[PDB]
Amino acid sequence: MKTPEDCTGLADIREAIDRIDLDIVQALGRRMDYVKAASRFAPERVAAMLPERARWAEENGLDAPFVEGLFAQIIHWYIAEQIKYWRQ
Amino acid sequence: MKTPEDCTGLADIREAIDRIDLDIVQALGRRMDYVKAASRFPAPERVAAMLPERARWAEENGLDAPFVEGLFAQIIHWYIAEQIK
């Protein structure tokens, strides 16, 4: 994939963004599959995770607050899904 | 990382998830770089076409479409505002 500076037009940009978004989706897909795995083995967890992701956003030129909110969103869905999967 | 079925304990799971979340953050980082380069040349048409598409990918990957689509709507929305900034 061309680097953003190597891109020669909107088409490159759009496809790059499509590939990246799809990677995110698949990553989320593999992420939720670990719910099944976890079952065969506290908010304290969320408390630890969010600040680590906030650091990661920083290291990637992103706005920490926004990135943090996304994962709280993602993490709460995963937890709830765990309980839901629990009641197979 | 180990596949879900390969995990032998919670450590494996927690590391896989930290690795996945980091992949997502980094992906978001690169996304912003392309969105910024876009100015060197999103319209309501583009966005209206993108969301359904992501909802589709979500389903092909065993995920909740509304949740995932909502998720990308926030991303697109927020990035749009980051550009103007």
XYZ file of N, CA and C in Angstrom:
519
model
N 0.858 -1.221 0.000
C 0.000 0.000 0.000
C 0.876 1.246 0.000
N 0.565 2.186 -0.882
C 1.325 3.420 -0.952
C 1.208 4.140 0.389
N 2.258 4.864 0.752
C 2.267 5.641 1.984
C 1.376 6.842 1.677
N 0.853 7.517 2.708
C 0.001 8.672 2.402
C 0.639 9.726 1.485
N 1.954 9.916 1.581
C 2.632 10.897 0.729
C 2.785 10.357 -0.695
N 2.910 9.036 -0.821
C 3.043 8.402 -2.132
C 1.714 8.361 -2.881
N 0.606 8.522 -2.165
C -0.696 8.488 -2.815
C -0.754 9.581 -3.873
N -1.353 9.257 -5.015
C -1.437 10.201 -6.123
C -2.833 10.755 -6.362
N -3.790 10.342 -5.541
C -5.146 10.826 -5.714
C -6.099 10.327 -4.645
N -7.357 10.754 -4.738
C -8.386 10.364 -3.784
C -8.674 8.861 -3.812
N -8.506 8.247 -4.977
C -8.748 6.818 -5.118
C -7.792 6.015 -4.220
N -6.509 6.375 -4.226
C -5.532 5.693 -3.388
C -5.940 5.838 -1.926
N -6.253 7.076 -1.546
C -6.655 7.417 -0.189
C -7.869 6.606 0.260
N -8.902 6.575 -0.576
C -10.127 5.848 -0.264
C -9.873 4.360 -0.056
N -9.116 3.755 -0.967
C -8.810 2.338 -0.849
C -7.962 2.096 0.395
N -7.037 3.006 0.679
C -6.188 2.843 1.852
C -7.085 2.829 3.079
N -8.011 3.780 3.138
C -8.925 3.853 4.261
C -9.844 2.631 4.325
N -10.230 2.081 3.176
C -11.081 0.896 3.176
C -10.318 -0.298 3.747
N -9.062 -0.443 3.332
C -8.233 -1.548 3.792
C -8.021 -1.435 5.302
N -7.753 -0.220 5.768
C -7.539 0.014 7.186
C -8.822 -0.239 7.982
N -9.944 0.288 7.514
C -11.188 0.061 8.234
C -11.485 -1.433 8.315
N -11.311 -2.138 7.202
C -11.557 -3.573 7.184
C -10.633 -4.283 8.178
N -9.376 -3.840 8.278
C -8.436 -4.451 9.228
C -8.996 -4.285 10.643
N -9.514 -3.093 10.920
C -10.088 -2.804 12.224
C -11.249 -3.766 12.509
N -12.155 -3.906 11.545
C -13.303 -4.807 11.689
C -12.874 -6.260 11.980
N -11.937 -6.773 11.187
C -11.444 -8.137 11.361
C -10.770 -8.273 12.726
N -10.038 -7.232 13.125
C -9.362 -7.221 14.418
C -10.421 -7.324 15.522
N -11.524 -6.595 15.363
C -12.612 -6.650 16.333
C -13.238 -8.048 16.308
N -13.311 -8.638 15.117
C -13.882 -9.970 14.978
C -13.052 -11.013 15.712
N -11.732 -10.935 15.570
C -10.863 -11.877 16.256
C -10.924 -11.567 17.747
N -11.070 -10.290 18.083
C -11.129 -9.886 19.483
C -12.290 -10.547 20.214
N -13.489 -10.455 19.648
C -14.647 -11.039 20.305
C -14.584 -12.560 20.374
N -13.833 -13.195 19.481
C -13.729 -14.653 19.530
C -13.022 -15.114 20.798
N -12.245 -14.220 21.409
C -11.545 -14.574 22.639
C -12.506 -14.632 23.817
N -13.768 -14.286 23.580
C -14.769 -14.347 24.637
C -15.049 -15.819 24.897
N -15.154 -16.588 23.821
C -15.389 -18.020 23.943
C -14.254 -18.624 24.762
N -13.025 -18.277 24.394
C -11.840 -18.790 25.068
C -11.804 -18.432 26.545
N -12.068 -17.172 26.862
C -12.038 -16.721 28.244
C -13.003 -17.456 29.159
N -14.160 -17.848 28.631
C -15.164 -18.533 29.443
C -14.672 -19.851 30.027
N -13.774 -20.535 29.325
C -13.268 -21.803 29.833
C -12.030 -21.625 30.720
N -12.047 -20.575 31.537
C -10.955 -20.271 32.460
C -11.501 -19.509 33.667
N -13.118 -8.009 36.594
C -13.698 -6.927 37.379
C -13.416 -5.587 36.703
N -14.244 -4.558 36.976
C -14.057 -3.226 36.383
C -12.614 -2.760 36.574
N -11.913 -3.452 37.463
C -10.519 -3.176 37.764
C -9.703 -3.363 36.481
N -10.190 -4.245 35.610
C -9.549 -4.546 34.331
C -9.660 -3.322 33.422
N -10.879 -2.813 33.289
C -11.138 -1.642 32.462
C -10.303 -0.476 32.960
N -10.211 -0.358 34.280
C -9.456 0.717 34.896
C -8.008 0.681 34.449
N -7.488 -0.514 34.217
C -6.103 -0.668 33.794
C -5.909 -0.505 32.283
N -6.854 -1.029 31.509
C -6.777 -0.980 30.052
C -6.866 0.406 29.415
N -7.885 1.173 29.782
C -8.085 2.498 29.211
C -6.856 3.402 29.205
N -6.144 3.505 30.338
C -4.959 4.367 30.359
C -3.832 3.858 29.460
N -3.794 2.551 29.237
C -2.761 1.969 28.391
C -3.064 2.323 26.928
N -4.338 2.294 26.565
C -4.726 2.624 25.201
C -4.569 4.125 24.965
N -4.776 4.907 26.023
C -4.640 6.354 25.939
C -3.183 6.663 25.622
N -2.272 5.908 26.223
C -0.852 6.108 25.958
C -0.568 5.772 24.494
N -1.155 4.676 24.027
C -0.979 4.231 22.649
C -1.457 5.274 21.637
N -2.596 5.904 21.915
C -3.133 6.925 21.019
C -2.103 8.038 20.896
N -1.586 8.460 22.044
C -0.582 9.513 22.119
C 0.594 9.158 21.213
N 1.112 7.944 21.388
C 2.250 7.463 20.612
C 1.931 7.346 19.131
N 0.657 7.472 18.771
C 0.293 7.362 17.367
C -0.317 8.642 16.786
N -0.012 9.770 17.422
C -0.503 11.053 16.957
C -2.005 11.225 17.019
N -2.652 10.468 17.896
C -4.101 10.546 18.030
C -4.510 11.254 19.314
N -5.775 11.657 19.375
C -6.314 12.322 20.552
C -6.694 11.244 21.561
N -5.971 11.189 22.672
C -6.221 10.187 23.697
C -7.680 10.054 24.140
N -8.305 11.152 24.611
C -9.703 11.086 25.056
C -10.629 10.326 24.111
N -10.567 10.655 22.824
C -11.426 10.004 21.840
C -11.140 8.511 21.704
N -9.861 8.164 21.654
C -9.441 6.776 21.523
C -9.831 5.994 22.769
N -9.770 6.666 23.907
C -10.112 6.036 25.167
C -11.605 5.710 25.168
N -12.411 6.667 24.723
C -13.844 6.459 24.679
C -14.232 5.308 23.774
N -13.529 5.151 22.656
C -13.838 4.060 21.733
C -13.652 2.711 22.415
N -12.542 2.553 23.124
C -12.291 1.287 23.791
C -13.208 1.019 24.975
N -13.708 2.072 25.615
C -14.624 1.870 26.735
C -15.873 1.285 26.090
N -16.161 1.790 24.900
C -17.310 1.353 24.129
C -17.082 -0.111 23.739
N -15.897 -0.384 23.204
C -15.524 -1.723 22.775
C -15.436 -2.684 23.953
N -14.819 -2.243 25.043
C -14.649 -3.109 26.208
C -15.962 -3.480 26.889
N -16.876 -2.522 26.997
C -18.161 -2.807 27.613
C -18.975 -3.771 26.760
N -18.829 -3.688 25.441
C -19.563 -4.596 24.568
C -19.026 -6.021 24.760
N -17.703 -6.137 24.832
C -17.035 -7.426 25.004
C -17.439 -8.094 26.322
N -17.422 -7.318 27.402
C -17.801 -7.817 28.719
C -19.235 -8.327 28.695
N -20.139 -7.484 28.203
C -21.546 -7.840 28.127
C -21.705 -9.090 27.280
N -20.947 -9.164 26.190
C -21.017 -10.319 25.304
C -20.567 -11.568 26.061
N -19.591 -11.404 26.954
C -19.095 -12.522 27.756
C -20.241 -13.127 28.558
N -20.926 -12.269 29.309
C -22.057 -12.663 30.144
C -23.149 -13.293 29.302
N -23.355 -12.733 28.115
C -24.376 -13.211 27.198
C -23.975 -14.574 26.659
N -22.695 -14.728 26.342
C -22.201 -16.002 25.845
C -22.233 -16.994 27.001
N -22.032 -16.489 28.215
C -22.062 -17.328 29.407
C -23.375 -18.100 29.429
N -24.475 -17.374 29.255
C -25.802 -17.973 29.247
C -26.064 -18.639 27.894
N -25.151 -19.524 27.501
C -25.243 -20.251 26.239
C -26.647 -20.790 25.996
N 0.403 -14.085 17.991
C -0.355 -14.487 19.172
C -1.029 -15.837 18.946
N -1.530 -16.429 20.027
C -2.208 -17.719 19.945
C -3.661 -17.520 19.533
N -4.193 -18.461 18.758
C -5.586 -18.382 18.343
C -6.421 -18.610 19.595
N -7.679 -18.152 19.595
C -8.502 -18.363 20.786
C -8.443 -19.813 21.295
N -8.638 -20.772 20.392
C -8.621 -22.177 20.776
C -7.267 -22.641 21.312
N -6.198 -21.959 20.911
C -4.848 -22.310 21.356
C -4.509 -21.775 22.745
N -5.252 -20.772 23.199
C -5.011 -20.189 24.510
C -5.111 -21.223 25.611
N -4.149 -21.182 26.524
C -4.085 -22.118 27.635
C -4.394 -21.450 28.966
N -4.726 -20.163 28.931
C -5.033 -19.445 30.152
C -5.401 -18.000 29.881
N -5.756 -17.266 30.929
C -6.138 -15.864 30.779
C -4.978 -14.955 30.331
N -3.747 -15.348 30.638
C -2.604 -14.546 30.228
C -2.579 -14.496 28.706
N -2.723 -15.654 28.068
C -2.725 -15.704 26.607
C -3.794 -14.770 26.055
N -4.982 -14.843 26.643
C -6.101 -14.033 26.196
C -5.865 -12.543 26.371
N -5.390 -12.150 27.547
C -5.128 -10.746 27.813
C -4.055 -10.173 26.901
N -3.043 -10.972 26.578
C -1.992 -10.492 25.689
C -2.508 -10.376 24.253
N -3.317 -11.342 23.819
C -3.864 -11.302 22.467
C -4.715 -10.034 22.307
N -5.513 -9.736 23.326
C -6.370 -8.567 23.304
C -5.564 -7.273 23.352
N -4.481 -7.240 24.130
C -3.673 -6.025 24.175
C -2.981 -5.829 22.831
N -2.644 -6.941 22.181
C -1.988 -6.899 20.881
C -2.988 -6.452 19.812
N -4.224 -6.918 19.934
C -5.269 -6.562 18.982
C -5.656 -5.089 19.124
N -5.844 -4.651 20.364
C -6.202 -3.267 20.627
C -5.109 -2.324 20.121
N -3.847 -2.711 20.306
C -2.730 -1.892 19.832
C -2.755 -1.842 18.294
N -3.104 -2.960 17.650
C -3.199 -2.990 16.185
C -4.256 -1.976 15.747
N -5.363 -1.932 16.485
C -6.450 -1.016 16.178
C -6.025 0.446 16.342
N -5.315 0.744 17.428
C -4.853 2.109 17.671
C -3.902 2.525 16.552
N -2.979 1.634 16.208
C -2.018 1.929 15.155
C -2.753 2.094 13.825
N -3.785 1.284 13.607
C -4.543 1.393 12.365
C -5.206 2.776 12.338
N -5.725 3.199 13.487
C -6.370 4.500 13.587
C -5.346 5.589 13.328
N -4.108 5.331 13.743
C -3.053 6.301 13.538
C -2.769 6.481 12.061
N -2.672 5.377 11.332
C -2.399 5.455 9.901
C -3.589 6.063 9.164
N -4.792 5.737 9.627
C -6.028 6.235 9.018
C -5.976 7.758 8.972
N -5.624 8.360 10.103
C -5.532 9.805 10.197
C -4.515 10.346 9.195
N -3.408 9.632 9.000
C -2.402 10.100 8.050
C -2.974 10.166 6.630
N -3.734 9.151 6.226
C -4.328 9.169 4.893
C -5.400 10.248 4.794
N -6.230 10.373 5.822
C -7.261 11.399 5.802
C -6.615 12.784 5.645
N -5.479 13.005 6.301
C -4.796 14.292 6.191
C -4.278 14.516 4.773
N -3.711 13.471 4.178
C -3.181 13.567 2.826
C -4.301 13.837 1.825
N -5.516 13.447 2.189
C -6.672 13.637 1.323
C -6.864 15.094 0.900
N -6.458 16.021 1.762
C -6.601 17.444 1.481
C -5.712 17.888 0.321
N -4.642 17.136 0.086
C -3.702 17.441 -0.986
C -4.401 17.413 -2.347
N -5.700 17.109 -2.337
C -6.496 17.051 -3.562
C -7.855 17.739 -3.404
N -14.786 14.101 3.930
C -15.528 13.278 2.966
C -16.954 13.764 2.679
N -17.326 13.725 1.404
C -18.647 14.152 0.965
C -19.721 13.235 1.542
N -20.956 13.743 1.677
C -22.058 12.943 2.221
C -22.299 11.654 1.429
N -21.937 11.664 0.149
C -22.104 10.485 -0.693
C -21.139 9.403 -0.208
N -19.868 9.776 -0.091
C -18.819 8.875 0.363
C -19.224 8.190 1.671
N -19.528 8.994 2.685
C -19.920 8.489 3.998
C -21.126 7.551 3.942
N -22.151 7.953 3.200
C -23.359 7.148 3.073
C -23.050 5.797 2.426
N -21.993 5.742 1.625
C -21.615 4.496 0.967
C -20.721 3.643 1.866
N -19.860 4.306 2.635
C -18.918 3.627 3.518
C -19.548 2.859 4.664
N -20.477 3.498 5.365
C -21.101 2.877 6.523
C -21.741 1.533 6.231
N -22.646 1.466 5.242
C -23.280 0.177 4.927
C -22.198 -0.874 4.668
N -21.167 -0.469 3.943
C -20.074 -1.363 3.632
C -19.459 -1.929 4.920
N -19.146 -1.059 5.882
C -18.559 -1.530 7.136
C -19.525 -2.438 7.892
N -20.817 -2.147 7.778
C -21.815 -2.971 8.435
C -21.695 -4.366 7.818
N -21.515 -4.407 6.500
C -21.362 -5.670 5.781
C -20.134 -6.443 6.281
N -18.992 -5.770 6.362
C -17.774 -6.424 6.830
C -17.987 -6.976 8.239
N -18.672 -6.189 9.065
C -18.957 -6.595 10.436
C -19.674 -7.945 10.452
N -20.678 -8.095 9.592
C -21.417 -9.348 9.542
C -20.566 -10.503 9.048
N -19.747 -10.267 8.025
C -18.887 -11.325 7.500
C -17.869 -11.760 8.551
N -17.696 -10.954 9.597
C -16.749 -11.305 10.646
C -17.414 -11.659 11.961
N -18.664 -12.109 11.882
C -19.405 -12.517 13.066
C -19.697 -11.467 14.128
N -19.781 -10.196 13.732
C -20.047 -9.107 14.671
C -21.394 -8.423 14.465
N -21.809 -7.657 15.472
C -23.057 -6.893 15.439
C -22.891 -5.735 14.452
N -23.697 -5.718 13.397
C -23.609 -4.669 12.385
C -23.929 -3.265 12.907
N -25.074 -3.092 13.595
C -25.411 -1.756 14.110
C -24.310 -1.195 15.019
N -23.829 -2.017 15.944
C -22.769 -1.587 16.852
C -21.553 -1.121 16.048
N -21.026 -2.027 15.232
C -19.855 -1.728 14.423
C -20.058 -0.535 13.483
N -21.214 -0.453 12.831
C -21.441 0.672 11.931
C -21.484 1.965 12.737
N -22.126 1.917 13.897
C -22.189 3.107 14.723
C -20.774 3.529 15.074
N -19.957 2.541 15.409
C -18.561 2.764 15.772
C -17.803 3.540 14.682
N -17.938 3.107 13.430
C -17.253 3.801 12.346
C -17.857 5.171 12.048
N -19.147 5.336 12.317
C -19.773 6.631 12.089
C -19.099 7.647 13.021
N -18.815 7.232 14.255
C -18.157 8.123 15.209
C -16.749 8.432 14.718
N -16.062 7.407 14.221
C -14.705 7.589 13.729
C -14.689 8.581 12.572
N -15.534 8.352 11.573
C -15.585 9.255 10.427
C -15.945 10.672 10.895
N -16.980 10.762 11.722
C -17.446 12.035 12.263
C -16.316 12.784 12.969
N -15.623 12.095 13.868
C -14.535 12.707 14.629
C -13.336 13.087 13.767
N -13.015 12.256 12.779
C -11.892 12.555 11.891
C -12.217 13.758 11.025
N -13.480 13.872 10.616
C -13.915 15.006 9.810
C -13.611 16.287 10.584
N -13.932 16.280 11.873
C -13.702 17.437 12.729
C -12.219 17.688 13.000
N -11.421 16.622 13.009
C -9.983 16.734 13.251
C -9.286 17.413 12.078
N -9.814 17.182 10.880
C -9.275 17.774 9.664
C -9.502 19.279 9.733
N -10.771 19.668 9.824
C -11.136 21.074 9.912
C -10.210 21.771 10.904
N -9.909 21.080 12.001
C -9.037 21.608 13.046
C -7.674 22.031 12.498
